[PDB]
Protein: mu-conotoxin giiia
Amino acid sequence: RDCCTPPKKCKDAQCKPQRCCA
Structure:
């Protein structure tokens, strides 16, 4: 589960500092 690719995942620290999340 990537932080921006479907299913995007923007909730954990390993995904928050991501333009597609922050």
About this structure: The chain is about 0% helix and 0% strand.
